[PDB]
Write an enzyme that holds these catalytic residues in place. Structure first.
Site, PDB file in Angstrom:
ATOM      1  N   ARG A  25       0.866  -1.169   0.000  1.00  0.00           N
ATOM      2  CA  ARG A  25       0.000   0.000   0.000  1.00  0.00           C
ATOM      3  C   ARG A  25       0.897   1.210   0.000  1.00  0.00           C
ATOM      4  O   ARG A  25       1.527   1.482   1.004  1.00  0.00           O
ATOM      5  CB  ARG A  25      -0.845   0.017   1.288  1.00  0.00           C
ATOM      6  CG  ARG A  25      -1.715   1.258   1.477  1.00  0.00           C
ATOM      7  CD  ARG A  25      -2.925   1.213   0.570  1.00  0.00           C
ATOM      8  NE  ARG A  25      -3.139   2.448  -0.185  1.00  0.00           N
ATOM      9  CZ  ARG A  25      -4.077   2.580  -1.123  1.00  0.00           C
ATOM     10  NH1 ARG A  25      -4.890   1.557  -1.400  1.00  0.00           N
ATOM     11  NH2 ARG A  25      -4.213   3.730  -1.792  1.00  0.00           N
ATOM     12  N   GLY A  26       0.947   1.951  -1.097  1.00  0.00           N
ATOM     13  CA  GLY A  26       1.724   3.185  -1.132  1.00  0.00           C
ATOM     14  C   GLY A  26       1.040   4.311  -0.388  1.00  0.00           C
ATOM     15  O   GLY A  26      -0.058   4.150   0.153  1.00  0.00           O
ATOM     16  N   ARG A  27       1.676   5.469  -0.349  1.00  0.00           N
ATOM     17  CA  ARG A  27       1.011   6.648   0.215  1.00  0.00           C
ATOM     18  C   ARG A  27      -0.195   7.045  -0.634  1.00  0.00           C
ATOM     19  O   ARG A  27      -1.183   7.525  -0.109  1.00  0.00           O
ATOM     20  CB  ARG A  27       1.966   7.828   0.291  1.00  0.00           C
ATOM     21  CG  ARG A  27       1.326   9.096   0.851  1.00  0.00           C
ATOM     22  CD  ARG A  27       2.374  10.185   1.038  1.00  0.00           C
ATOM     23  NE  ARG A  27       3.370   9.752   2.007  1.00  0.00           N
ATOM     24  CZ  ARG A  27       3.175   9.734   3.314  1.00  0.00           C
ATOM     25  NH1 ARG A  27       2.034  10.152   3.824  1.00  0.00           N
ATOM     26  NH2 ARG A  27       4.124   9.291   4.110  1.00  0.00           N
ATOM     27  N   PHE A  28      -0.115   6.824  -1.941  1.00  0.00           N
ATOM     28  CA  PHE A  28      -1.127   7.326  -2.850  1.00  0.00           C
ATOM     29  C   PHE A  28      -1.804   6.280  -3.683  1.00  0.00           C
ATOM     30  O   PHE A  28      -2.579   6.594  -4.558  1.00  0.00           O
ATOM     31  CB  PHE A  28      -0.499   8.336  -3.794  1.00  0.00           C
ATOM     32  CG  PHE A  28       0.102   9.503  -3.096  1.00  0.00           C
ATOM     33  CD1 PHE A  28      -0.710  10.419  -2.437  1.00  0.00           C
ATOM     34  CD2 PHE A  28       1.480   9.679  -3.071  1.00  0.00           C
ATOM     35  CE1 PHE A  28      -0.158  11.514  -1.797  1.00  0.00           C
ATOM     36  CE2 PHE A  28       2.032  10.765  -2.432  1.00  0.00           C
ATOM     37  CZ  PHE A  28       1.217  11.683  -1.789  1.00  0.00           C
ATOM     38  N   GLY A  29      -1.522   5.029  -3.448  1.00  0.00           N
ATOM     39  CA  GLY A  29      -2.131   4.041  -4.289  1.00  0.00           C
ATOM     40  C   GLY A  29      -1.788   2.655  -3.837  1.00  0.00           C
ATOM     41  O   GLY A  29      -1.052   2.454  -2.867  1.00  0.00           O
ATOM     42  N   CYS A  30      -2.321   1.708  -4.585  1.00  0.00           N
ATOM     43  CA  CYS A  30      -2.196   0.311  -4.304  1.00  0.00           C
ATOM     44  C   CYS A  30      -1.196  -0.310  -5.276  1.00  0.00           C
ATOM     45  O   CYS A  30      -1.332  -0.099  -6.485  1.00  0.00           O
ATOM     46  CB  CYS A  30      -3.563  -0.282  -4.544  1.00  0.00           C
ATOM     47  SG  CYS A  30      -3.593  -1.929  -3.931  1.00  0.00           S
ATOM     48  N   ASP A 147       9.983  11.477   1.164  1.00  0.00           N
ATOM     49  CA  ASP A 147       9.460  10.387   1.993  1.00  0.00           C
ATOM     50  C   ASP A 147      10.388   9.195   2.024  1.00  0.00           C
ATOM     51  O   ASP A 147       9.974   8.070   1.815  1.00  0.00           O
ATOM     52  CB  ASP A 147       8.030   9.991   1.569  1.00  0.00           C
ATOM     53  CG  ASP A 147       7.233   9.299   2.682  1.00  0.00           C
ATOM     54  OD1 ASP A 147       7.595   9.380   3.892  1.00  0.00           O
ATOM     55  OD2 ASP A 147       6.211   8.654   2.327  1.00  0.00           O
TER      56      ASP A 147
HETATM   57  C1  LIG Z   1       6.726   0.112  -6.747  1.00  0.00           C
HETATM   58  N1  LIG Z   1       6.609  -0.184  -5.344  1.00  0.00           N
HETATM   59  C2  LIG Z   1       6.227   0.694  -4.401  1.00  0.00           C
HETATM   60  C3  LIG Z   1       6.216  -0.017  -3.118  1.00  0.00           C
HETATM   61  C4  LIG Z   1       6.568  -1.349  -3.382  1.00  0.00           C
HETATM   62  C5  LIG Z   1       6.738  -2.429  -2.510  1.00  0.00           C
HETATM   63  C6  LIG Z   1       7.162  -3.644  -3.041  1.00  0.00           C
HETATM   64  C7  LIG Z   1       7.407  -3.733  -4.430  1.00  0.00           C
HETATM   65 CL1  LIG Z   1       7.899  -5.249  -5.042  1.00  0.00          CL
HETATM   66  C8  LIG Z   1       7.246  -2.655  -5.292  1.00  0.00           C
HETATM   67 CL2  LIG Z   1       7.594  -2.810  -6.992  1.00  0.00          CL
HETATM   68  C9  LIG Z   1       6.826  -1.439  -4.750  1.00  0.00           C
HETATM   69  C10 LIG Z   1       5.819   0.672  -1.779  1.00  0.00           C
HETATM   70  C11 LIG Z   1       5.214   2.086  -1.926  1.00  0.00           C
HETATM   71  N2  LIG Z   1       5.455   2.582  -3.247  1.00  0.00           N
HETATM   72  C12 LIG Z   1       5.876   2.143  -4.480  1.00  0.00           C
HETATM   73  O1  LIG Z   1       6.004   2.846  -5.465  1.00  0.00           O
END
Ligand SMILES: Cn1c2c(c3ccc(Cl)c(Cl)c31)CCNC2=O
Length: 310
Positions: A25-30, A147
Site C-alpha cells: 500500500r503506497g502513500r497514494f495508491g495500491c 518520503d
Molecule cells: C513500486 N513499489 C512501491 C512499493 C513497493 C513495494 C514492493 C514492491 Cl515489489 C514494489 Cl515494486 C513497490 C511501496 C510504496 N510505493 C511504491 O512505489
C-alpha cells in the site's frame, strides 16, 4: 517468469496483462504484483483523488536521466477507463523481495550485505539528488524525494537497493531560496526542522531533510546486522522503542526536537571497526544541525570506505 492458468486478461500496450495480488500500500495508491507478457511487473493503481500524485510521479520519471540501476525502473503510465471511472496506472519493475522494511522484518543481514544495500541505496539517493547537465535527453534537475524510509527502498534478487515512490518528489532547477512548512512525509522520519514546521524553500534544505531520514534507514540496517556476532532483536521502526508505532506530532517533537534523541547506537557495535564507522556516519546524517548533515554522495563514499576497512 510466470504461471499460466488460462483465464480472462487485460491489455497494456496491446500486451496481455493480469493482476496477481496486492503487494503493498503506497502513500497514494495500491501496488499490485502483475504479469505482463512473460514478466512480473508492479502496477500501482491510484484513486482519482490522488491524480496529482500519479501526475507527479509520471513527471518525475519523465525527467532527463531517470534510468539508473538504483532507481526503481519505470515501465509506463496510463490514464485508462472513462472520465467518469478513471483508472490511473503506473507500471514499474517488480522485485520479489519487496521493501527493505519487509526484508528486515523477516531477515538479518551480514556486514557485507549491509554494506551492499547501504552503498546501493546511497548511490540511488545521490543520483536522485544530483543536478546533471548534458544528457542526451536534457538537464536532469536535483530531485528531493520527501518520503525516504525503508518502505520506499526495494531490494533486487542480489540485495541491490533501489529508490521507489516519487509521488511527493520535488525537483529543483536552481540553488536560490524561495521563502515554507513541509510535513508531507512520514512523521517518524521527519527531521527536527520539519517537526517544528519552519523550513527554507531551497534545494539544500530539502536534500538535508532526505539525508536525516536516510540516516534512520541506515540505523534500521545496523539494527538487523549480524556484524561482530552479537544479539539481534526483532525489527523495530525508528523511534518505536521510545514512542511506539503511531506517534503524534507532539510525541515526535518531544523526543526528536526537545530531547534531541535518536535511535540507540548499541555499545557492542563500537567493537567492530566497520560498524563503528557506520555509527559515525549515521550520527552525521541525523544531526540536529541540518548544515552538518552529510550529502548523499559523501555517504556513498563512507560506505565504500568502511566496506574496504582493514
Ligand atoms: C513500486 N513499489 C512501491 C512499493 C513497493 C513495494 C514492493 C514492491 Cl515489489 C514494489 Cl515494486 C513497490 C511501496 C510504496 N510505493 C511504491 O512505489
Amino acid at each position: 517468469s510466470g504461471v499460466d492458468l488460462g483465464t480472462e486478461n487485460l491489455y497494456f500496450q496491446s500486451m496481455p496483462l493480469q493482476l496477481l495480488e496486492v503487494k503493498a500500500r503506497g502513500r497514494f495508491g495500491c501496488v499490485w504484483k502483475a504479469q505482463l507478457l512473460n514478466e512480473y511487473v508492479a502496477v500501482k493503481i491510484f484513486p482519482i483523488q490522488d491524480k496529482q500524485s500519479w501526475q507527479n510521479e509520471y513527471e518525475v520519471y519523465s525527467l532527463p536521466g531517470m534510468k539508473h540501476e538504483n532507481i526503481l525502473q519505470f515501465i509506463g503510465a496510463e490514464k485508462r477507463g472513462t472520465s467518469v471511472d478513471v483508472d490511473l496506472w503506473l507500471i514499474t519493475a517488480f522485485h520479489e523481495k519487496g521493501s527493505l522494511s519487509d526484508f528486515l522484518k523477516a531477515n538479518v543481514v551480514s556486514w557485507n550485505e549491509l554494506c551492499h544495500i547501504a552503498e546501493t541505496m546511497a548511490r540511488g539517493l545521490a543520483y536522485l539528488h544530483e543536478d546533471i547537465p548534458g544528457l542526451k535527453d536534457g538537464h536532469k534537475p536535483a530531485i528531493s524525494h520527501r518520503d525516504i524510509k525503508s518502505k520506499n527502498v526495494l531490494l533486487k534478487n542480489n540485495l541491490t537497493a533501489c529508490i521507489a515512490d516519487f509521488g511527493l518528489a520535488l525537483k529543483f532547477e536552481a540553488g536560490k531560496s524561495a521563502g515554507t512548512h513541509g510535513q508531507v512525509g512520514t512523521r517518524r522520519y521527519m527531521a527536527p526542522e520539519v517537526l517544528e514546521g519552519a523550513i527554507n524553500f531551497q534545494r539544500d534544505a530539502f536534500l538535508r531533510i532526505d539525508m536525516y531520514a536516510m540516516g534512520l534507514v541506515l540505523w534500521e540496517l545496523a539494527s538487523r546486522c549480524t556484524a561482530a556476532d552479537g544479539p539481534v532483536d526483532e525489527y523495530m521502526l525508528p523511534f518505536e522503542e521510545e514512542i511506539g508505532q503511531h506517534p503524534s506530532l507532539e510525541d515526535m517533537q518531544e523526543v526528536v526536537v526537545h530531547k534531541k534523541k535518536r535511535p540507540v547506537l548499541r555499545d557492542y557495535w563500537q567493537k567492530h571497526a566497520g560498524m563503528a564507522m557506520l555509527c559515525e556516519t549515521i550520527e552525521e546524517c541525523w544531526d540536529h544541525d541540518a548544515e552538518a548533515r552529510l550529502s548523499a554522495g559523501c555517504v556513498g563514499e563512507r560506505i565504500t570506505q568502511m566496506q574496504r576497512l582493514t
